[PDB]
Design an enzyme around this catalytic site. Structure first.
Site, PDB file in Angstrom:
ATOM      1  N   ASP A   1       0.858  -1.174   0.000  1.00 44.85           N
ATOM      2  CA  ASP A   1       0.000   0.000   0.000  1.00 44.85           C
ATOM      3  C   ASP A   1       0.906   1.240   0.000  1.00 44.85           C
ATOM      4  OD1 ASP A   1      -2.364  -1.599   0.143  1.00 44.85           O
ATOM      5  OD2 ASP A   1      -2.288  -1.607   2.359  1.00 44.85           O
ATOM      6  N   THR A   2       1.950   1.255   0.829  1.00 42.62           N
ATOM      7  CA  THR A   2       2.826   2.405   0.880  1.00 42.62           C
ATOM      8  C   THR A   2       3.751   2.462  -0.363  1.00 42.62           C
ATOM      9  OG1 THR A   2       2.728   2.459   3.303  1.00 42.62           O
ATOM     10  CG2 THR A   2       4.616   3.566   2.271  1.00 42.62           C
ATOM     11  N   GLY A   3       4.524   1.416  -0.605  1.00 40.63           N
ATOM     12  CA  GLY A   3       5.571   1.470  -1.631  1.00 40.63           C
ATOM     13  C   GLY A   3       5.067   1.474  -3.061  1.00 40.63           C
TER      14      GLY A   3
ATOM     15  N   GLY B   1      -0.242   8.333   1.273  1.00 41.97           N
ATOM     16  CA  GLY B   1      -0.533   9.712   1.502  1.00 41.97           C
ATOM     17  C   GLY B   1      -1.429  10.326   0.455  1.00 41.97           C
TER      18      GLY B   1
ATOM     19  N   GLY C   1      -8.388   1.036  -2.316  1.00 46.15           N
ATOM     20  CA  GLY C   1      -9.341   0.052  -2.839  1.00 46.15           C
ATOM     21  C   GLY C   1     -10.374  -0.344  -1.779  1.00 46.15           C
TER      22      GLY C   1
ATOM     23  N   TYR D   1      -9.507  -1.430   1.288  1.00 47.57           N
ATOM     24  CA  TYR D   1      -8.850  -1.172   2.547  1.00 47.57           C
ATOM     25  C   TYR D   1      -9.103   0.247   2.912  1.00 47.57           C
TER      26      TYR D   1
ATOM     27  N   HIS E   1      -1.677  -7.840   7.220  1.00 46.41           N
ATOM     28  CA  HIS E   1      -1.374  -6.441   6.975  1.00 46.41           C
ATOM     29  C   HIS E   1      -0.136  -6.120   7.836  1.00 46.41           C
ATOM     30  CE1 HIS E   1      -5.590  -5.675   5.530  1.00 46.41           C
ATOM     31  NE2 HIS E   1      -5.806  -6.652   6.381  1.00 46.41           N
TER      32      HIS E   1
END
Ligand SMILES: [Cu+2]
Ligand SMILES: [Cu+2]
Lengths: 620, 620
Positions: free
Chosen positions: A290-292, A297, A372, A374, A425
């Site tokens: 999700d981050t990479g 953000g 999505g 999440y 997660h």
């Protein structure tokens, strides 16, 4: 004046201009990432040079670039073409989300698969999913998304109720080709809706909840200056925001009498990955970074007073770039407020007659994001007593599949025929430590049981032991809940009044780490997630535990590559990377919209102070 | 009306009258324990029979009695003389505490030891502590307390700052004799004061904290009927109080549509033990069982609005017996209120366009107790989503020693010369389960990692396994944090709409269990504390994991005796006993009064409901 201030719209516009002028932002170009760079060590202090780092994609197939610009001076510091087959693809663009569905809607393999299942192509949503790196040689250096189908019966319908299992597609989003359609066979599409605002499903809404009013008649106890500098109950820090990491805390320090004492130089969630544990080929490739890969953000929600953040709230509204370099404000994207937190300290002393009670409170800095299905809330807490805590709140809608006839070892049933593949997660907190300044070290502390015998004749004694992590090769650590294992970050050159190095102790939740086989692609690409605690020597180019370009990178990037330098970390400028996560076997109660579940960690002072730091808190 | 109502002052007076009339409560008798008993299994069985159980001490040295009275019928049901050297001494009487210091003040050995340290006996407080069972054969059958000395410089001084190490005395509190005075040599008595209301030590009090006002303009959302029956947001329960256990929750159930569904029949903290890990002979005997030896309920604080319990608070004022059988109210001993608890569920859906947020709240039932240096808060929470949680909050003043000149493996330094012996605070929660009624079973659930290979070619799969605990012999379980171990209580005869037995999952914190050598006195006396989870078959006389009489009682009773029966627990009326605790290596920040630290557990529904139970919560 602060070099840690948030980016302004005008700085982003100035980046756009510098890029376009240098010939780096033609119509085929798209900004996949843009962020301010932190100040360098030993600034210093001055000539401030606000620099921004940018990743530029080319929708015509040219090589992407990484580019660093100075907004202070109006210059390109560097611009480098990337070989993506080597160093990874750029993050998924928001404008690519739709493209998977569009390409598939005119592909005859995809139309054949839908027609077999009697599904109207107009009603079929396709989730745009990251591809990873598996067996498909043709994908290397190509920008690929994979697509899983979900039926939406009408515009306000929850498509997650109606997964189309047995079907997956792979697309090249630059060449606009559908490279593969895989149909392993027809599964019923679950038919019950999951529309959690339909009265037919909710029933009559409760009328039993009476209001809880939280107010601050003199306003909040914190002050915000220079846009993002917070001062609260001895704490001092700067609240940053980056489109990849989200909220980032800088310069966390505590005013202990006359001295501002640093504790953490930089705190962030530097990666968050969602590996799936269903060995069906429809999903066995699925690992969302999700981050990479997606950049959390950029999908931060606008948070609504009374609903999302309750009480006396002070908002920040960070500014980011769109794909073309224009600034875009995330209105009310960050909530800041202080909360009551029950009893701080209490004693009723028989001998003295003195009955003493004090209340606790915490400063909260939070945001919420949606990727999505999440939705995640990221919360940082600072307590009166010097404790620092992070909590992630996971909610949203379960990412669904069919539930196989005859059950599954890897999928749970939510509703009739509706499955929920098992997944984790897993987060990485990157804590650039500065316990009373930069000269730090980490010890692993275990409880030590003792044997009954001489020196311990009643068999009651117990103790503990500390092991200093002296080099990076020794600094990849695992949990041991049964022995009470924690890790202490201390400054060997700064001693409290009792002549012991000042410290802070990290308390983990000791949840399971990455479960995948150690020879798996995801174990290689998310190696950070296989262990609880990593310590590195600080370096300005070591930012993420998965490296800079996670999307379709082959493996080994980030922490395992950093740690391989085997640098000295015994009284040096160091960075702690703590892995923590949830392992989710979804319940019926998680459907049709999931109640929040949480995970996190905290750090508590450990002989940092010369006595309790909250003796000066007044009676309530 | 309800047979689970709190004891009334009239009932307690009436027990006194009944006992007096029966010849059981003459002027030499003292009530060491009195409590109402729960109704017997099966209540279709006819009217109420409120029965009380009493432990009666005799100050003349005659044997004590255990008596059960029917206050309804005015009868003694049973009365038996106890042989305390076999089955254990009665709980410590409040009146016995002061006896230790009183008797020592004129003992020539004690006076000699104090004179050797230049201490004025008028200034020496003596902590009156439980004795346990060690090698002193003369103690067998006698009521002993042990004393440790602390200097109080003036009436409002905190004596804990001034331990007198190297000295301990043992006292027979019935014959009023000092049996032993042990002096192992003088230590310096730490001189720094610990007076946390002295401006000299606090400094100027903060003026930075602005008020946080929590109000409920329409009152609370829960109702209280029959004195102690709570209804809140689908939950139903009765809030009991017992002098030994404190707050006890009965008949915890949840209204799902038209059906009141039981979850937990009875929840309590059935024991707590605080073992010390300093092998010095001055303290190596030190272990207190706050619940079983002291009776935590009787020392419940009166809780003050605005500092102890903040918001719209509803109090209970439980009634207990004094030592003579007269009723005594604990005014405002129990706080009940509902708290905001952040986000409950949130999703912003791209495809549907619907943005959804709901808020959570919890019902809180709490009390706070003080015994000597220690102060503990016991908090039960019920959440909207069906989660049940317990939290203990430990605070007070650290129980101190000297800090040895060469350092210590078993004691930490707080202030110059001032030590804090290592110790644990370990609780046992007794959960008499009733998941959709009494036919229940427990499974141990572990995550299962899978090897990359056929059926799992990408090495991503993971699973889980459940092992049913079929008989008590197999039901003594340990934590395994690394494999995400939890325990599910289910009803094999009550299935959800997906045809799976309804369940609740216990999530432990996986803290260290009892650290003492298994050959120690404390490992036998606190055997429960050696393992994380026990399951028994329900029995009327199996109340506490340490048995009915813990004071100066060896092994032989409690859980290891119960489990020997090897009873069927696979779909039967069963009781879960969860051990959980803190392991405390005191920090400088814990002195001179300690900030709260917490530990607990929770249970979450696991296919209990047919979908999320909070879809009917309205927007805020
Ligand atoms: Cu999940
Ligand atoms: Cu403690």
């Amino acid at each position: 004046a602060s070099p840690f201030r948030l980016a302004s719209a005008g700085e982003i516009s100035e980046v756009q201009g510098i890029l376009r002028t240098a010939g780096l932002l033609g119509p085929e170009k798209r900004i996949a990432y843009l962020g301010v760079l932190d100040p360098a060590r030993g600034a210093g202090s001055e000539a401030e040079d606000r620099r921004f780092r940018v990743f530029i994609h080319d929708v015509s197939g040219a090589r992407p670039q990484e580019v660093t610009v100075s907004v202070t001076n109006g210059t390109v510091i560097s611009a480098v073409e990337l070989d993506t087959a080597a160093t990874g693809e750029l993050p998924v663009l928001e404008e690519e989300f739709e493209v998977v569905e569009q390409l598939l809607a005119t592909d005859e393999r995809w139309l054949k698969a839908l027609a077999a299942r009697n599904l109207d192509v107009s009603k079929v949503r396709v989730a745009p999913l990251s591809a990873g790196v598996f067996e498909y040689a043709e994908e290397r250096g190509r920008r690929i998304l994979r697509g899983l189908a979900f039926v939406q019966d009408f515009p306000e319908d929850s498509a997650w109720a109606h997964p189309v299992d047995g079907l997956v597609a792979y697309v090249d989003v630059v060449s606009k080709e559908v490279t593969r359609v895989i149909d392993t066979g027809v599964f019923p599409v679950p038919a019950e809706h999951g529309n959690y605002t339909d009265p037919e499903l909710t029933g009559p809404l409760r009328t039993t909840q009476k209001p809880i009013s939280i107010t601050q008649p003199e306003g909040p106890s914190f002050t915000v200056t220079g846009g993002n500098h917070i001062e609260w109950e001895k704490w001092s820090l700067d609240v940053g925001f980056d489109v990849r990491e989200g909220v980032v805390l800088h310069n966390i320090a505590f005013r202990d009498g006359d001295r501002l004492r640093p504790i953490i130089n930089r705190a962030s969630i530097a990666e968050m990955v969602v590996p799936y544990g269903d060995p069906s080929p429809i999903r066995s490739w699925q690992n969302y970074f999700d981050t990479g890969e997606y950049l959390v953000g950029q999908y931060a929600n606008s948070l609504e007073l009374g609903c999302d953040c309750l009480g006396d709230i002070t908002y920040l509204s960070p500014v980011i770039s769109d794909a073309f370099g224009n600034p875009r404000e995330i209105r009310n994207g960050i909530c800041m407020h202080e909360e009551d937190w029950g009893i701080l300290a209490k004693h009723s002393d028989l001998w003295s007659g003195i009955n003493y009670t004090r209340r606790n409170r915490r400063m909260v800095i939070s945001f919420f994001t949606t990727i999505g299905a999440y939705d995640y809330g990221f919360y940082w807490y600072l307590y009166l007593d010097g404790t620092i805590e992070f909590e992630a709140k996971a909610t949203g809608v379960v990412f669904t599949s069919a539930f196989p006839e005859g059950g599954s070892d890897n999928i749970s049933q939510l509703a009739p025929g509706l499955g929920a593949p098992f997944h984790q997660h897993i987060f990485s907190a990157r804590l650039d430590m500065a316990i009373d300044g930069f000269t730090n070290r980490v010890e692993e502390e275990d409880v030590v049981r003792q044997t009954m015998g001489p020196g311990n004749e009643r068999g009651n004694a117990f103790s503990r032991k500390r092991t200093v992590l002296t080099r990076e090769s020794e600094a990849v650590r695992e949990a041991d809940a049964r022995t009470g294992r924690t890790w202490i970050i201390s400054n060997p050159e700064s001693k409290n009044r009792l002549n012991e190095p000042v410290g802070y102790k990290l308390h983990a939740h000791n949840q399971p780490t990455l479960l995948a086989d150690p020879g798996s692609s995801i174990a290689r690409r998310a190696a950070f997630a296989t262990k609880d605690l990593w310590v590195t020597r600080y370096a300005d180019d070591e930012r993420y535990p998965t490296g800079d370009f996670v999307n379709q990178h082959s493996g080994g990037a980030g922490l395992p590559s950093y740690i391989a330098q085997d640098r000295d970390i015994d009284g040096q400028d160091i960075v702690v990377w703590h892995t923590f996560g949830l392992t989710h076997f979804p319940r019926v109660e998680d459907w049709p919209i999931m109640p929040v579940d949480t995970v996190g960690f905290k750090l508590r002072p450990e002989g940092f102070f010369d006595r309790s730091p909250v003796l000066d808190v007044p009676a309530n």
